RNA sequence: CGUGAGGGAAAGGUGAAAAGAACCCCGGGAGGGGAGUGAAAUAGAGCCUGAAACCGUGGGCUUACAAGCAGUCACGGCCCC
RNA sequence: GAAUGCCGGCAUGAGUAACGAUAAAGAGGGUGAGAAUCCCUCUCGCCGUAAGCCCAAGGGUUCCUACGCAAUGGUCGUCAG
RNA sequence: CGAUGUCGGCUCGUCGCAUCCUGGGGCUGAAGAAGGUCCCAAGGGUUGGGCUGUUCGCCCAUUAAAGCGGCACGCGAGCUGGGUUCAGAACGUCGUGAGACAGUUCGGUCUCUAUCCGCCACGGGCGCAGGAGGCUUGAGGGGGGCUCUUCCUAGUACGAGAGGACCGGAAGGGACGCACCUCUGGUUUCCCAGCUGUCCCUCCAGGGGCAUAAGCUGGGUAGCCAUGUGCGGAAGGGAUAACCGCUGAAAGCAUCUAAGCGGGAAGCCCGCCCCAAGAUGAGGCCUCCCACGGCAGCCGGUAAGGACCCGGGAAGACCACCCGGUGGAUGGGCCGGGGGUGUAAGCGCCGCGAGGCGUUGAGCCGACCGGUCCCAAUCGUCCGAGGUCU
């Protein structure tokens, strides 16, 4: 018996792979499928990742936005089948893996410690240059 | 309800 | 009433309806009936199921006597299921179907020598104002002269945990027949690679 | 996460700026209010000839908190304050505008007219 | 605390109730296969530094 | 509780603990053999195992990791030059041990050799 | 013991005679076992006599469904004479 | 037979509390009847306006060697004030 | 009085019922809704704050409700020590005075070790007439027992209106309880990184010690966790309380009763969950051993089986329990995956330099899911039936 692989076996149905790499640092652009009443539709939020915490099918990220005068931050898991879609807006470049620093920076400052990831912001449109 | 000691504190 | 033996394996949560649903994997098949108490013969109603394979170089006389009767492997693990009398000579998780709810009995997990805050939740003692050694001590434990002694089932530290304990009315989300798993919705006592045993349940 | 001397920020031109709970409107006894729960609260501090003024004992429905929800597609949602909305006891606001976001969880708790008024819904 | 004492003297009997328990348990010993000398099971046997077969230690 | 955790304590804090086992590995490595507790003989397996599978590496990075450790470069040459190279072969299991017939006169504790192998 | 004035104990007995145990044996030694001395050595120096509490070894009878100031009265079983 | 009597002896509590700063230990090699504890080596840790050094009180051979381990040493002891 | 520690709080309960709530009733100056008043009922529940040392009380905000009492005014070998009993000091007052005052003020030594009973846990022993390995029956115990809002029925019955049901159905909560760790959120004593001073290795580079029993800082697996998740209170059957009747005399009528029969509570019995055959009343089933050598007894070897020892374990203080012991994946290594950390060292290139870029999601890397006999569970030993009699 190995009860990881069962484990693995019961996930394999629900997992993705279809959504974009992105890592700690990121902005990222997430289209969320949202319940309004009495229809549905997609909401986008949209922020910099400041944490991704891996668990295989469980791995879960979370998206800091400032919106109208309040900071938001949004907790999505990797593979939830209400996310339409992802887009990366912008490749920014950590020094560490998670980002809960940026909680108590200026918008100023946060420019300035997530310079853009010039690396793989290249690597980003040398692929989809496609056939 | 408050009512008088019949014994002292123990001292050494 | 109807039962399976199966150790658990772990939990996950799974994706239904747009809903996050918190579910224990169970491996319950397959168990083979090894015996039947009857009440001509035992006084009551149960089926005695076997359960995982065992190397036969473990297995004793008077033990490979009974599976034999019954024309039986050797199993590792045996346990009865009362008023239950499936009409196999093989028990598997196809039983349940989903959407019935079940009642999932284990050992739970052991917590050894308990204090009485963890064990009986109790408050303990203040941690300043003159508190004296007494932050997780369980206060009185009586009165005085009358009556003198101590009730017996007085809640007290002490051992907690590693005993038989049953959940019920869980939900089967799924069942997996071609790996033997159950897929139950919340939690089930004890740990990864404990026995457990799943039971249609007794709730209405 | 909302209990008895938690201070909130509130959310709307009442006049009121601060208030502080005194009690969590659930049931017998709640420990804890969060979003689209209905608190009764202390003014703490207000700005000159609001429709409240300091010391008033008002009631409010949360609208933000720090402590994150859940939600059963398995999300959450977490804001950078405590954040409520001024009400009058038919739960309708008690200002014309309400400022920053507010949990969509209102909605489905009969806060609609604030959910409207609300620049954004998360 | 208020310093608890012994009420009674514990009798002859009593005290060595208490140490029905109290017996030692002998060494449990084999013999090493090469020397036959006595030894614990599971050691490097003292004697002739034999252990699995092979010499293994100066005795 | 203790439930699924790895790692003897060992009756020492995390500093001195740390310094026992490398103190052990520098003897070990030294002598091929020397005699200890069982408790930490056990425990001083893995330790040393690990320093021998890097010096079966070889690099100048393996060196440097296994000096944090040993300190000793004569020490480590004779790791790398001498050592290492009787477990080209061997997948894992460079040490062994196997527990003496007599305990310690003057505290009852129990004894244990802890060798590198053939 | 008290700075001091001052307070202030415990502790006797081998044998007639040292004849106070050569020598051998186990043991690092202490101790013991033989040999020897003696009327006597459980008079062997930790020495006349050697009570009692207290500790232990061996044997007889007895005890793990039972209620106690522990005894007493009766009967029965077992052991001994 | 009692005086919380006096003197002494021996019990109970009990193989229990404790073994006196949480600066810290590990291995190898000696020695010896016997070694966690004595000597030597290497590694590790602690003090460094001290936990090092030098005076004065006070103590009085405790100093240095050799030979010892009954008792003293809170364990051990081959070591030692 | 050769000592029965004394108010209040805390902690932990437990009982009573003259019942605060919830359940069931009768009467009502009971239209409905909502009250009053009495009866039955102790199963559960009975909130958070301000003031005072307070008990109490008043007040704020709620609530189904914010019940009253007993237990040495329950509980100081359980804690507190604010109050009241000491020594200090002052004020008012009384006294020539020393001092005093059910008058006030500020301060003021609360004792490591549980023998017996009792209590919570855990073993050892012997017994359960053959000896054993498993699986069970449940006598008898314990646990639990709460409750609100909204919607539908229906703006209906009832009312002029205001207001607004019974019965029946549906959803959603608060507090409590048991388990659990997928998620959320904590811890994670060395799993990774960054930083300072100093000493050191080896000069640079790269490192190690120490700064705490982690030097500091940012993160963090498994585990153990709640703030997170699942689930529970029931349903249902039975017998009842007050109370309501059917039939019905004594008493041509009447009468719930004297014969007899119905209805009827969150309460009582069962039902749910857990313990349980030391239940000496020691139960039941399945399976294994067997008909030993010597003179209901003894000794001696065995049978089936057990223990010893060992490798370990979400088991655990020791013990016990559980797994495994080479015909083996038990721990340790090693390898693969997960996970954390977040791009090592070395070199190259750019810059006067601090650095930066590339190699590179690199290097390192506890516990998590696995594989692999490389290391160690070597080799063994000791117990252990012969079945009493009607
Ligand atoms: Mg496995
Ligand atoms: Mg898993
Ligand atoms: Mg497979
Ligand atoms: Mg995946
Ligand atoms: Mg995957
Ligand atoms: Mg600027
Ligand atoms: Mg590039
Ligand atoms: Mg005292
Ligand atoms: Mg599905
Ligand atoms: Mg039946
Ligand atoms: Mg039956
Ligand atoms: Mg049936
Ligand atoms: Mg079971
Ligand atoms: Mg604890
Ligand atoms: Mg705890
Ligand atoms: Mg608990
Ligand atoms: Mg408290
Ligand atoms: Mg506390
Ligand atoms: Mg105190
Ligand atoms: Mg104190
Ligand atoms: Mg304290
Ligand atoms: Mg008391
Ligand atoms: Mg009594
Ligand atoms: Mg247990
Ligand atoms: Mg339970
Ligand atoms: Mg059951
Ligand atoms: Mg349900
Ligand atoms: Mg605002
Ligand atoms: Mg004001
Ligand atoms: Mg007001
Ligand atoms: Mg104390
Ligand atoms: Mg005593
Ligand atoms: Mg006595
Ligand atoms: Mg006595
Ligand atoms: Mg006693
Ligand atoms: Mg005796
Ligand atoms: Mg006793
Ligand atoms: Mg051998
Ligand atoms: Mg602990
Ligand atoms: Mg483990
Ligand atoms: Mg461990
Ligand atoms: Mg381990
Ligand atoms: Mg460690
Ligand atoms: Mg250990
Ligand atoms: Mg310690
Ligand atoms: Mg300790
Ligand atoms: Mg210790
Ligand atoms: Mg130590
Ligand atoms: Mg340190
Ligand atoms: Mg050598
Ligand atoms: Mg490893
Ligand atoms: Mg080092
Ligand atoms: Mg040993
Ligand atoms: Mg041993
Ligand atoms: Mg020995
Ligand atoms: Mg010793
Ligand atoms: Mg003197
Ligand atoms: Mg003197
Ligand atoms: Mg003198
Ligand atoms: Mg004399
Ligand atoms: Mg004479
Ligand atoms: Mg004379
Ligand atoms: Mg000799
Ligand atoms: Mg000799
Ligand atoms: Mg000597
Ligand atoms: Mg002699
Ligand atoms: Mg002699
Ligand atoms: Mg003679
Ligand atoms: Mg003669
Ligand atoms: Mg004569
Ligand atoms: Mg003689
Ligand atoms: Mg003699
Ligand atoms: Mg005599
Ligand atoms: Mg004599
Ligand atoms: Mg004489
Ligand atoms: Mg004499
Ligand atoms: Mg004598
Ligand atoms: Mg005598
Ligand atoms: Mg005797
Ligand atoms: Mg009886
Ligand atoms: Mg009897
Ligand atoms: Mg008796
Ligand atoms: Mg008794
Ligand atoms: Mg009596
Ligand atoms: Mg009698
Ligand atoms: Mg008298
Ligand atoms: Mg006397
Ligand atoms: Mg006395
Ligand atoms: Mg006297
Ligand atoms: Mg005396
Ligand atoms: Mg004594
Ligand atoms: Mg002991
Ligand atoms: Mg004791
Ligand atoms: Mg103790
Ligand atoms: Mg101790
Ligand atoms: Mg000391
Ligand atoms: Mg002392
Ligand atoms: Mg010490
Ligand atoms: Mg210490
Ligand atoms: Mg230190
Ligand atoms: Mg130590
Ligand atoms: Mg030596
Ligand atoms: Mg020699
Ligand atoms: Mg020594
Ligand atoms: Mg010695
Ligand atoms: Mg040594
Ligand atoms: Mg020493
Ligand atoms: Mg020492
Ligand atoms: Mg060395
Ligand atoms: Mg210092
Ligand atoms: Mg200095
Ligand atoms: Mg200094
Ligand atoms: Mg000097
Ligand atoms: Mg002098
Ligand atoms: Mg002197
Ligand atoms: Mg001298
Ligand atoms: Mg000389
Ligand atoms: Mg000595
Ligand atoms: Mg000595
Ligand atoms: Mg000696
Ligand atoms: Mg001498
Ligand atoms: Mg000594
Ligand atoms: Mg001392
Ligand atoms: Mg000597
Ligand atoms: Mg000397
Ligand atoms: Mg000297
Ligand atoms: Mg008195
Ligand atoms: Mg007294
Ligand atoms: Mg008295
Ligand atoms: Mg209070
Ligand atoms: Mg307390
Ligand atoms: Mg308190
Ligand atoms: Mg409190
Ligand atoms: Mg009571
Ligand atoms: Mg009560
Ligand atoms: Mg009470
Ligand atoms: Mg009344
Ligand atoms: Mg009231
Ligand atoms: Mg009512
Ligand atoms: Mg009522
Ligand atoms: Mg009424
Ligand atoms: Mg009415
Ligand atoms: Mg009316
Ligand atoms: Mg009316
Ligand atoms: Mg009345
Ligand atoms: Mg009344
Ligand atoms: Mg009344
Ligand atoms: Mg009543
Ligand atoms: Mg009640
Ligand atoms: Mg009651
Ligand atoms: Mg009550
Ligand atoms: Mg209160
Ligand atoms: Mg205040
Ligand atoms: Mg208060
Ligand atoms: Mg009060
Ligand atoms: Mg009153
Ligand atoms: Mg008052
Ligand atoms: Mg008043
Ligand atoms: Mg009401
Ligand atoms: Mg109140
Ligand atoms: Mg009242
Ligand atoms: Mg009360
Ligand atoms: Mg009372
Ligand atoms: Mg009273
Ligand atoms: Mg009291
Ligand atoms: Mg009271
Ligand atoms: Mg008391
Ligand atoms: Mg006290
Ligand atoms: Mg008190
Ligand atoms: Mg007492
Ligand atoms: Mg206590
Ligand atoms: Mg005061
Ligand atoms: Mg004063
Ligand atoms: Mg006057
Ligand atoms: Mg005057
Ligand atoms: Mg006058
Ligand atoms: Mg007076
Ligand atoms: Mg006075
Ligand atoms: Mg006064
Ligand atoms: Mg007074
Ligand atoms: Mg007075
Ligand atoms: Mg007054
Ligand atoms: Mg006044
Ligand atoms: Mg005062
Ligand atoms: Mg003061
Ligand atoms: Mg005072
Ligand atoms: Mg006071
Ligand atoms: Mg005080
Ligand atoms: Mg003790
Ligand atoms: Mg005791
Ligand atoms: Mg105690
Ligand atoms: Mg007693
Ligand atoms: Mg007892
Ligand atoms: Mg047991
Ligand atoms: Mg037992
Ligand atoms: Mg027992
Ligand atoms: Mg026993
Ligand atoms: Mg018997
Ligand atoms: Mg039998
Ligand atoms: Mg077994
Ligand atoms: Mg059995
Ligand atoms: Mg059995
Ligand atoms: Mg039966
Ligand atoms: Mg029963
Ligand atoms: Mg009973
Ligand atoms: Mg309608
Ligand atoms: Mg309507
Ligand atoms: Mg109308
Ligand atoms: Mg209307
Ligand atoms: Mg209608
Ligand atoms: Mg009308
Ligand atoms: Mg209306
Ligand atoms: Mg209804
Ligand atoms: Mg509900
Ligand atoms: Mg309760
Ligand atoms: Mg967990
Ligand atoms: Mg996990
Ligand atoms: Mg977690
Ligand atoms: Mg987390
Ligand atoms: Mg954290
Ligand atoms: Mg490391
Ligand atoms: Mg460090
Ligand atoms: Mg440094
Ligand atoms: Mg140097
Ligand atoms: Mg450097
Ligand atoms: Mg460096
Ligand atoms: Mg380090
Ligand atoms: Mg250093
Ligand atoms: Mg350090
Ligand atoms: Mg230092
Ligand atoms: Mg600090
Ligand atoms: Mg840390
Ligand atoms: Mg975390
Ligand atoms: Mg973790
Ligand atoms: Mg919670
Ligand atoms: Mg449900
Ligand atoms: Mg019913
Ligand atoms: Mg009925
Ligand atoms: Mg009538
Ligand atoms: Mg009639
Ligand atoms: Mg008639
Ligand atoms: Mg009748
Ligand atoms: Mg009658
Ligand atoms: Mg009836
Ligand atoms: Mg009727
Ligand atoms: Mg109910
Ligand atoms: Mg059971
Ligand atoms: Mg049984
Ligand atoms: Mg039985
Ligand atoms: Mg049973
Ligand atoms: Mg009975
Ligand atoms: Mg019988
Ligand atoms: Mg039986
Ligand atoms: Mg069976
Ligand atoms: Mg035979
Ligand atoms: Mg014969
Ligand atoms: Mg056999
Ligand atoms: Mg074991
Ligand atoms: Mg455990
Ligand atoms: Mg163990
Ligand atoms: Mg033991
Ligand atoms: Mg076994
Ligand atoms: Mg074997
Ligand atoms: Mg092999
Ligand atoms: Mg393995
Ligand atoms: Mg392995
Ligand atoms: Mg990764
Ligand atoms: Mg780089
Ligand atoms: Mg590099
Ligand atoms: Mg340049
Ligand atoms: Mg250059
Ligand atoms: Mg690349
Ligand atoms: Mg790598
Ligand atoms: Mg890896
Ligand atoms: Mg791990
Ligand atoms: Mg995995
Ligand atoms: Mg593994
Ligand atoms: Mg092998
Ligand atoms: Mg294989
Ligand atoms: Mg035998
Ligand atoms: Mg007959
Ligand atoms: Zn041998």
């Not at chain 1, 300035?112 to 056939?131: P, S, Y």
């Not at chain 3, 007494?134 to 007085?154: A, D, F, L, Q």
């Not at chain 4, 969880?105 to 008024?117: P, W």
């Not at chain 6, 997948?91 to 192998?117: F, I, N, S």
């Amino acid at each position: 018996m190995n009860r990881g692989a069962l484990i693995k076996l019961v996930e394999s149905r629900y997992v993705r792979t279809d959504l974009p790499e992105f890592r700690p640092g990121d902005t990222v652009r997430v289209s969320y499928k949202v319940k309004e009443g009495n229809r549905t539709r997609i909401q986008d939020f949209e922020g910099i990742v400041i944490r991704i915490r891996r668990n295989g099918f469980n791995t879960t990220f979370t998206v800091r936005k400032v919106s109208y005068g309040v900071g938001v931050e949004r907790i999505f898991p990797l593979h939830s089948p209400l996310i339409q879609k992802i887009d990366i807006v912008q490749r920014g470049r950590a020094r560490r893996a998670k980002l809960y620093f940026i909680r108590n920076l200026s918008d100023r400052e946060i420019r300035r410690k997530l310079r853009a990831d010039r690396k793989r912001i290249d690597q980003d449109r040398a692929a989809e240059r496609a056939a | 309800v408050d009512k008088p000691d019949y014994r002292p504190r123990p001292r050494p | 009433m109807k039962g399976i033996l199966g150790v658990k394996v772990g939990m996950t949560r799974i994706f239904r309806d747009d809903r996050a649903v918190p579910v224990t994997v169970i491996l319950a098949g397959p168990c083979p009936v090894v015996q039947r108490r009857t009440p001509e013969k035992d006084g009551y109603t149960a089926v005695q199921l076997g359960f995982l394979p065992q190397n036969p170089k473990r297995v004793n006389r008077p033990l490979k006597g009974h599976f034999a009767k019954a024309g039986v492997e050797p199993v590792r693990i045996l346990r009865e299921i009362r008023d239950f009398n499936p009409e196999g000579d093989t028990v598997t998780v196809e039983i349940f179907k989903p959407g019935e709810r079940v009642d999932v009995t284990g050992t739970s997990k052991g917590r050894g020598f308990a204090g009485v805050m963890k064990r009986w939740n109790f408050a303990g003692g203040p941690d300043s104002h003159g508190a004296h050694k007494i932050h997780r001590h369980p206060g009185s434990i009586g009165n005085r002269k009358t009556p003198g002694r101590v009730y017996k089932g007085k809640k007290m530290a002490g051992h907690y945990g590693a005993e038989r304990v049953t959940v019920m009315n869980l939900e089967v989300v799924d069942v997996i027949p071609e790996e033997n798993l159950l897929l139950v919705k919340g939690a089930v006592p004890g740990p990864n690679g404990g026995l457990v045993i799943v039971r249609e349940t007794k709730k209405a | 996460m909302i209990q008895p001397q938690t201070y909130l920020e509130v959310a709307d031109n009442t006049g009121a700026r601060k208030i502080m709970c005194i009690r969590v409107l659930k049931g017998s006894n709640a420990k804890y209010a969060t979003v689209g729960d209905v608190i009764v609260a202390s003014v703490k501090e207000a700005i000159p000839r609001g429709a409240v003024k300091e010391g008033d004992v008002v009631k409010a429905v949360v609208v933000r908190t720090k402590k994150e929800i859940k939600r059963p597609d398995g999300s959450a949602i977490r804001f950078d304050d405590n954040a409520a909305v001024i009400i009058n006891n038919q739960l309708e606001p008690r200002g014309t505008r309400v400022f920053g976001p507010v949990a969509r969880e209102l909605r489905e708790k009969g806060f609609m007219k604030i959910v409207s008024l609300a620049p954004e819904v998360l | 605390a208020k310093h608890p004492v012994p009420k009674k003297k514990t009798s002859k009997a009593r005290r060595d109730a208490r140490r029905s328990h109290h017996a030692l348990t002998p060494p449990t010993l084999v013999p090493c296969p090469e020397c036959k000398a006595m030894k614990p099971p599971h050691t490097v046997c003292p004697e002739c530094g034999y252990y699995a077969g092979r010499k293994v230690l100066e005795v | 509780m203790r439930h699924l955790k790895s790692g003897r304590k060992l009756n020492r804090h995390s500093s001195h603990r740390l310094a026992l086992y490398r103190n052990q590995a520098k003897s070990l490595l030294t002598h091929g053999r020397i005699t200890t507790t069982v408790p930490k003989a056990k425990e001083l397996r893995g330790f040393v195992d690990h320093l021998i599978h890097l010096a079966k590496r070889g690099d100048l990075h393996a060196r440097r990791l296994v000096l944090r450790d040993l300190q000793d470069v004569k020490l480590v040459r004779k790791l790398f030059d001498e050592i290492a190279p009787r477990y080209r072969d061997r997948q894992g299991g460079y040490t062994r041990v196997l527990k003496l017939a007599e305990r310690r006169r003057g505290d009852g504790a129990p004894l244990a050799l802890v060798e590198l192998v053939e």
